[PDB]
Amino acid sequence: EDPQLLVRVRGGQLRGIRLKAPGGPVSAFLGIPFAEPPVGSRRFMPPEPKRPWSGVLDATTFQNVCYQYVDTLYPGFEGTEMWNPNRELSEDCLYLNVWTPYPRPASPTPVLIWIYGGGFYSGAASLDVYDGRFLAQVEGAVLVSMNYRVGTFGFLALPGSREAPGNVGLLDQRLALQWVQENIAAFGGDPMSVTLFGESAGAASVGMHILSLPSRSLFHRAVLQSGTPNGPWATVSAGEARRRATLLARLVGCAANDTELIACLRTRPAQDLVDHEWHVLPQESIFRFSFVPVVDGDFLSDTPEALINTGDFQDLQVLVGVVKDEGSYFLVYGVPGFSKDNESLISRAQFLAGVRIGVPQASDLAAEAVVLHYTDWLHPEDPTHLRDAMSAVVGDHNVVCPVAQLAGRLAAQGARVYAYIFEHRASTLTWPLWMGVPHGYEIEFIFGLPLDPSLNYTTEERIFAQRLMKYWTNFARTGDPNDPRDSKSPQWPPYTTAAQQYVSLNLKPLEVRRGLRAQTCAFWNRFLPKLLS
Amino acid sequence: EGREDPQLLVRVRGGQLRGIRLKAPGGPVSAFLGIPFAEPPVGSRRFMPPEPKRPWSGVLDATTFQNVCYQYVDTLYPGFEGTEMWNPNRELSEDCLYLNVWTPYPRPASPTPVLIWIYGGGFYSGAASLDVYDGRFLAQVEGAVLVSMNYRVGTFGFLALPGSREAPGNVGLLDQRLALQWVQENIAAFGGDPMSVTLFGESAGAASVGMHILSLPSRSLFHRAVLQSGTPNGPWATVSAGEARRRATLLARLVGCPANDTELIACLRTRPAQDLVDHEWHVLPQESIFRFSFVPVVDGDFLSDTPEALINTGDFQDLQVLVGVVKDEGSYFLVYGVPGFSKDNESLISRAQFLAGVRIGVPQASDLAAEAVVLHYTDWLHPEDPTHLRDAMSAVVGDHNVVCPVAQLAGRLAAQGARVYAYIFEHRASTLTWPLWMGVPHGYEIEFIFGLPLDPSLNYTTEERIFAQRLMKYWTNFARTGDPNDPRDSKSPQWPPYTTAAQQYVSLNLKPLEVRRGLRAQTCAFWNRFLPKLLS
Ligand SMILES: CCN(CC)CCNS(=O)(=O)c1cccc(C(F)(F)F)c1
Ligand SMILES: CCN(CC)CCNS(=O)(=O)c1cccc(C(F)(F)F)c1
Ligand SMILES: CCN(CC)CCNS(=O)(=O)c1cccc(C(F)(F)F)c1
Ligand SMILES: *[C@@H]1O[C@H](CO)[C@@H](O)[C@H](O)[C@H]1NC(C)=O
Structure with missing residues (x-):
């Protein structure tokens, strides 16, 4: 075996793979589990840290994509597919990816942590567009990317309920943030220099970590591309979240107690939830998404606006930015x-x-x-x-x-x-x-x-x-x-x-x-x- | 007559005039000044629609400017030309309905297109006699027949208790209409063409022009319009009937004037003109600029509906119509109000x-x-x-x-x-x-x-x-x-x-x-x- 591909982290041993970037090789470790698979009764629940393992876990391949709606407006068209899932869909999706130079850095390297977008309803760290080899190779960066729960599975909330308190997708991210603190040193990364970057829904998560105290100790810098925690689409009120959850539950056939309701939801195949995900929007809109972070007074003490205002x-x-034509993309999706x-x-x-x-x-x-x-x-x-x-x-x-x-x-x-x-x-x-x-x-x-x-x-x-x-x-x-x-x-x-x-x-x-x-x-x-x- | 200039003696429907040969850079012009076109709107005719001037005997000397219509006089900047040039340059009097005529010298042989000027000044002021409205140059240089006229301003021209007989509103506008009628009857005696009459005016004058376009009885008195830095539509050129009554009544109180509207108006008619002026600015609803106390009222008469309604439909x-503005329409007003x-x-x-x-x-x-x-x-x-x-x-x-x-x-x-x-x-x-x-x-x-x-x-x-x-x-x-x-x-x-x-x-x-x-x-x-x- 190759020493540059064996790493011992807190939970066991991993075997990465050696990948060929244009300018040289890089060490990659894909499909690293950071949490217990939030399936079954663990649906809607906060994530739990992944149990230790025996032997050498194979981390040379991309894990599954979190369960989400898949787009079908222009089937087989590169412009839309490049964002679609490129691995099987599974609720068992809590895995992350680390790229580093080969041989792995000699002295502690600054860490980039990427958070994808997809309006909190789609996305995956396995997308070719998110390939970390180039930065690792060319800039010798250590680069990390995690999958987090999207759509109903990550953001369905019945605020104040024990079994669906919302924001768990953001907790999934927070936990990979933790993982990086506890483990990244092993790959040569500097837990004391962690920049977060993200785009669309991703930029907003970054923002939400900035704005949530429990996170401000897991990173030192942020980049928000084409997205913010503030604004018309990135959050809902507790009352609006409760509304959609309840509406969805009605839509698949679940009218009583929080516990009873979610219980019934938990007994529903993934595609059923996604089948209706869209039907709960309050208006015929664009750039609106059904299950997004909720202002719970927990992860988010107050609204992002109140929070940034003071x-x-x-x-x-912070590095903040947009592109020239932020709106164009959305119009083809139902604007007459x-x-x-x-x-x-x-x-x-x-x-x-x-x-x-x-x-x-x-x-x-x-x-x-x-x-x-x-x-x-x-x-x-x-x-x-x-x-x-x-x-x-x-x-x-x-x-x-x-x-x-x-x-x-x-x-x-x-x-x-x-x-x-x-x-x-x-x-x-x-x-x-x-x-x-x-x-x-x-x-x-x-x-x-x-x-x-x-x-x-x-x-x-x-x-x-x-x-x-x-x-x-x-x-x-x-x-x-x-x-x-x-x-x-x-x-x-x-x-x-x-x-x-x-x-x-x-x-x-x-x-x-x-x-x-x-x-x-x-x-x-x-x-x-x-x-x- | 017999030893005068045979080129300065003209007759009009009201009688004989003697005008004056003025000098301009390029040559002489004929000027006839202070031609009365209405009976003096004084005493019990104050606030009333103008009555057409009654013929006179003898040759009326039309060689000097007549009285300026009673108005508030600017004192903000004493002796400063910037302001003075707009201030009245003849005695103030309620007897002020007179027009002026300038023409080539000698008068044209073929009918000449006619320009009628209407001064602005917010409806609170203005005189056809100011230097800046001198027809001598347009007359001499372009061969224009130029007519400019006095019309009642302030309370005297526009104070209205709408619906009533004694203060119907808009009489200022009616003075003008009367001068347009005068031109239609008489302008050929000076060589002007009544088949070709063009109104023009600035600010409230411009607004005035707009208002004739909009008022049916005026639309046979002219053929073309110029509107300089003013319009009949907009925030300041007109007030509702309700608001005109509101301000008329308020003025009355301020001056002791508490057969309902009849009694009220009758009392006002007993006030010195100067006491009316002294109180004109107090009836404004808010601290403001580019608002004036007594402007044309929407009466459903001179103005059938609101100007805005009329231009829309x-x-x-x-x-x-030729219209336009200056680069800085607003600057002048700031120094009269904005701290x-x-x-x-x-x-x-x-x-x-x-x-x-x-x-x-x-x-x-x-x-x-x-x-x-x-x-x-x-x-x-x-x-x-x-x-x-x-x-x-x-x-x-x-x-x-x-x-x-x-x-x-x-x-x-x-x-x-x-x-x-x-x-x-x-x-x-x-x-x-x-x-x-x-x-x-x-x-x-x-x-x-x-x-x-x-x-x-x-x-x-x-x-x-x-x-x-x-x-x-x-x-x-x-x-x-x-x-x-x-x-x-x-x-x-x-x-x-x-x-x-x-x-x-x-x-x-x-x-x-x-x-x-x-x-x-x-x-x-x-x-x-x-x-x-x-x-x-
Ligand atoms: C970086 C963006 N692209 C271009 C190199 C990556 C690959 N295209 S794809 O994954 O998005 C993909 C994979 C499989 C099929 C298809 C489609 F062509 F049918 F659309 C697309
Ligand atoms: C990661 C960046 N984007 C691509 C630019 C991913 C998908 N676009 S979207 O979620 O931001 C989006 C874009 C357009 C329409 C819709 C839909 F929900 F209406 F389907 C969603
Ligand atoms: C129409 C000709 N102008 C030339 C600018 C003369 C000044 N009179 S005013 O209406 O334009 C005017 C000018 C300045 C202040 C006020 C006041 F009403 F606010 F007092 C009125
Ligand atoms: C014009 O200029 C002359 C000097 O050339 C000066 O004496 C006179 O007072 C000026 N008149 C005006 C109107 O300013």
């Missing part, structure tokens, strides 16, 4: 007149129709406010503008403005913030051009995929991917994405409340801009709330 | 002062509507910059009151059949006496349109003369033909009509015409489209 972030360091197979030019009417969807909570008047604000009064009926507007609304509503809000809140309250906007459209992107740089297409670059010679990316992009892996790791190492030996380019300045500087991430060297949709986000973050209050 | 194929602001400093305000100012500048806005205003005009990169705030404050006031109503008007008119030409006037006079920060304020296009820079003794620059002349060509071409362009100077930039499809309009300044798209389009969607929903 937290003390004296000792925090949109499709990836035509340029989706819309009429004024469909534009109105579509606003009541991307802002499901909006009053009649609140919606009119949006429409008037995003209409280009020079070309109020121009089909291209109307389409592009629809995207902007949805992206600004759900991502850009919430992010602007968090940055502003953090910076103002002591935190050290770096903000980007990601502006480069993949050469091999399979979505139409009208969607621009969609939600989730910075990831491949951060993870270093363009170095995969066979992915047919251009050289410019290979160079670009390398530049980001640096930023991200320099951040992990130092809390500052700036090369301490660079050099080009103009240096990435911290986001502040006074100047509000962020940078564009594109093929050209860094350019500094001021104000993250300042005027438009003022409208979302400052005025609209009055309009509904 | 009208048919204006036959209408040729922080003054002509004698650079008026850099704080955020606090800006929020306080928005309430004043938008007096009828709820707390929520005001937040909306403040969030729109705030620059969220620099929400505390004193210079930005100073200029946003100016822009709230300008947009709300002029630029957006004008935008609203052009939009509805074009959409409904009318030829509209729109402009923005961007040139600050080298001679302007206000501070730089005010930009090109409300009213400082007038001197150029009337051609005052041609007066050599006014110390304007050569460019400004060329420029003043260009603008007279535009105005006077539009008067002639309904189109401001020149068929003969065809190579020069064209001035396209404003259309809902392209919202085109031109910049007016020392440089050749530039065409632009969209009258503060986005910001006016706010004022014109959203804000009304925020309260509906």
Whole structure:
């Protein structure tokens, strides 16, 4: 056997596998169990630390994907499949993955911990897009990724009940966080330098760890990509959670006590739960998800907004960002007149129709406010503008403005913030051009995929991917994405409340801009709330 | 007669006039001044609709300006030209219904298109005799027949107890209508063409013009319209009947005037004119700017419905209107009310002062509507910059009151059949006496349109003369033909009509015409489209 592939952790012995990255080998350990399989009566329950094992456990292969809805809108299409599960579905999914350089680091390496997205209803650490070999190999990072329970299995809550207190998916993450503290040293990783990063639902979990005291001792830095704990989609109230749980239970046939109800749910095949997962939304919406974290006054003392509005972030360091076209991706998923197979030019009417969807909570008047604000009064009926507007609304509503809000809140309250906007459209992107740089297409670059010679990316992009892996790791190492030996380019300045500087991430060297949709986000973050209050 | 100038003696329906030959830079003009067109609206005719002037005997000397209609006089800035130039320059009297006529010298042989000017001044002030309204240049240089007229302002012109016989409302507007009638009967005696009459006016004058377009009995008295920095629609140009009554009654109390409306009015008719003026500003519902106590009332008579209603639903194929604004419609008003602001400093305000100012500048806005205003005009990169705030404050006031109503008007008119030409006037006079920060304020296009820079003794620059002349060509071409362009100077930039499809309009300044798209389009969607929903 190969010594560089045998590791003893607190629970037993593991055998990793030696993988070939373009530039050299890396040691990988996949399918590492961090919890007792939360199946049977353990459904909806917090996770328990995994029992010790005998012999040498094989950790050379990806474990199962947590049970979730699978998308089927464009069957066999790379643009959607790249996010679908690539291993069997199982409730038995509590496993993590560690990549490290080969030979494993000589001195304690900073740790990256990735948390996936998928709107709290899908996702997996086995996705090719999340391949950790490149960062480990090129930047010599130790990189960790866990599976956590999504959808009903991870976030169905009957608040205040003992048998379904909610947030267990986030507990699954918190427990892998712990695992890394107890075990990562063995792989050469530095438990004293752990950066979390994540996108979409993932960025919000990161945020929620920032905001939950029990977690603030498991990491030292965060990166939130295209997602926040605050905002319209990442949390529900206890009353809203209770509502959906109860509704679902009704939907599969379970009207009495908390204990009785959940008991019956526990006796239901996975696909039954997923079969109705979607039917419990309060409105015909987009960028809305059925089972998400709940404000329980436990994991979350209060709402993320209350929490960011008054937290003390004296000792925090954070990288926050969006892409150029946060909204596009979502429109093809049920917004009348949109499709990836035509340029989706819309009429004024469909534009109105579509606003009541991307802002499901909006009053009649609140919606009119949006429409008037995003209409280009020079070309109020121009089909291209109307389409592009629809995207902007949805992206600004759900991502850009919430992010602007968090940055502003953090910076103002002591935190050290770096903000980007990601502006480069993949050469091999399979979505139409009208969607621009969609939600989730910075990831491949951060993870270093363009170095995969066979992915047919251009050289410019290979160079670009390398530049980001640096930023991200320099951040992990130092809390500052700036090369301490660079050099080009103009240096990435911290986001502040006074100047509000962020940078564009594109093929050209860094350019500094001021104000993250300042005027438009003022409208979302400052005025609209009055309009509904 | 017999030894006078045979070229200064004309007859009108009321009798014989003797006018005066005036000198202008380029030659002589004929001027007839203080021609009475109505019986003096005094004593028991105070507040009443004007009665047509009764013929006189002998030749009436029409060589000097008549009395200015009784009005409040600005004292904010004593002896300062900036303000003085708008103050009455003849004795104040309730006997003030007189018009003026300027024509070439000698008078034209073929019928000449006629320009009728109507002064602004909030309906609280204004005189056709101010220097800035001198027809001598348009007359001499373009061969225009120019008519300007006095009309009752303040209480005397617009105080109304709606529904009553003694104070029906709008008599100020009726004075004007009477002068238009006068032109239709008499203007041919001076060589003017009654088949070709063009109204024009600024601020309240502009609003006035709007109101004749909108008022059926006026729409045979003219053929074309110009509206400078004012509109019949908007926040300040009109009040409901309920609100007019509210203010009439309030004024009465303030002056001791407690057969119901009859008794009330009768008492008011016994008050010195000066006591009425002394109390005019107290009937305002809120601390404000760009609001005036006594303006036209929506009576369902002169004005059948509200101006807003009428422009929304009208048919204006036959209408040729030229409209526009100045770069800085709002600056002038700030120094008369908004704490922080003054002509004698650079008026850099704080955020606090800006929020306080928005309430004043938008007096009828709820707390929520005001937040909306403040969030729109705030620059969220620099929400505390004193210079930005100073200029946003100016822009709230300008947009709300002029630029957006004008935008609203052009939009509805074009959409409904009318030829509209729109402009923005961007040139600050080298001679302007206000501070730089005010930009090109409300009213400082007038001197150029009337051609005052041609007066050599006014110390304007050569460019400004060329420029003043260009603008007279535009105005006077539009008067002639309904189109401001020149068929003969065809190579020069064209001035396209404003259309809902392209919202085109031109910049007016020392440089050749530039065409632009969209009258503060986005910001006016706010004022014109959203804000009304925020309260509906
Ligand atoms: C990094 C993103 N891609 C591109 C290299 C990874 C692989 N595509 S896939 O896993 O998402 C996959 C796997 C199997 C089938 C299909 C489909 F083509 F049918 F869609 C796709
Ligand atoms: C990890 C990033 N994304 C891809 C960009 C994963 C899936 N997209 S989504 O969850 O964020 C999403 C996107 C669009 C529609 C829906 C649906 F719920 F309506 F189906 C979900
Ligand atoms: C119409 C011609 N203007 C030129 C700008 C003369 C000034 N009168 S005002 O209505 O425009 C005006 C000007 C300043 C203050 C006020 C007040 F009503 F608030 F007092 C009114
Ligand atoms: C114009 O200029 C002359 C000096 O060239 C000056 O004496 C005169 O007072 C000025 N008049 C005005 C109107 O300013």
